[PDB]
């Protein structure tokens, strides 16, 4: 089961739940950078289900989701802020509204 985990950097890394505990879960990450870990539930959420000025998330770097504002859009391009960077549609999304686990 797929999940997103808050890194110590406040960004969210994709993963899945390999095991459940009384007070932890065991996540493996969908990346070779990070190993299996027991995690507190308040650090874990579900991934989300299926415009300028917007508050969005963005895919960056091990890569994961950071909170960003679209400063300006032109052509294929979005100027975003977190630092500042020019990205394309595929690296962006509205904020994952999901809450962490209870």
Numbering used by the authors: 3 to 52, 59 to 69, 75 to 95, 102 to 121
Quote the study's own text:
FMRP, Fragile X Mental Retardation Protein, and its autosomal paralogues, FXR1 and FXR2 (Fragile X mental Retardation Syndrome-related Protein 1 and 2, respectively), comprise a family of RNA-binding proteins. The N-terminal region of FMRP, and the FXR1 and FXR2 paralogues, contains a nuclear localization signal between residues 1 and 184. In this work, we present the crystal structures of the NLS of the FXR1 and FXR2 paralogues and definitively classify this region as a member of the Royal Family comprising a tandem Tudor repeat. Extensive structural and biochemical analyses also suggest that this region recognizes tri-methylated protein substrates in a sequence-specific manner common to both paralogues.
The crystal structures of the N-terminal tandem Tudor domains of FXR1 and FXR2 were determined at 2.50 Å and 1.92 Å, respectively, and revealed a conserved architecture as compared with the same region of FMRP. The N-terminal Tudor domain (Tud1) spans residues 2 to 49 of FXR1 and residues 13 to 56 of the FXR2 protein. The Tudor domains tilt toward one another to generate an interdomain angle of approximately 110°. Interaction between Tud1 and Tud2 creates an interface of 257.5 Å2 for FXR1 and 258.9 Å2 for FXR2. The orientation is stabilized in FXR1 by an ionic lock formed by inter-domain salt bridges between E6 and R47 from Tud1 and E65 and R112 from Tud 2. Hydrogen bonds between the mainchain atoms of F14 from Tud1 (F25 in FXR2) and W78 (W89 in FXR2) of Tud2 lend further stability to this region. Finally, the C-terminal extension comprising residues V114 to K122 (or V125 to A131 in FXR2), which fold back along the base of the tandem Tudor domains toward the N-terminus, engages in extensive interactions with the intervening segment that tethers the individual Tudor domains. The residues defining this pocket (Y95, W97, V66, and E104 for FXR1) are strictly conserved amongst the Fragile X paralogues.
